[PDB]
Amino acid sequence: AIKIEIPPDAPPQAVADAAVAALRAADPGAARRRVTFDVTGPDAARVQALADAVVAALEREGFKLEKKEENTDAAGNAGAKYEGEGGLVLNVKQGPEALTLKITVDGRTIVEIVR
């Protein structure tokens, strides 16, 4: 597993690309498994910017995502779910903790990037 602290000025595409590279370094076979990306943070707009960057990075690897749903929980936190083939999921969720991108492979957290 890898955890990265990334400078607060790194643009979302640099964050997404670091996570995909970290994933390849930690599990080069992850593409064959059940993979969930989780993008969470307090500012709804920075959260969506990083989610968009994750979609773009995966699309370049050949992994297509479809927005399945938008949602709002009891606190009013906005969220969204994207799914691809093979159980690929991208969960997007507003929450108090610092902006984070996590990658879980077969139920185990493999990559965490915190801003």
In DSSP terms, which residues pair with 35 in a beta bridge? 105
Contacts of residue 3, defined as CB under 8 A and 6 or more positions apart, other chains included, come to: 111, 112, 113, 114
Measuring CA to CA, which residue among 39, 78, 85 is closest to residue 62? 85
* Technique used: X-ray
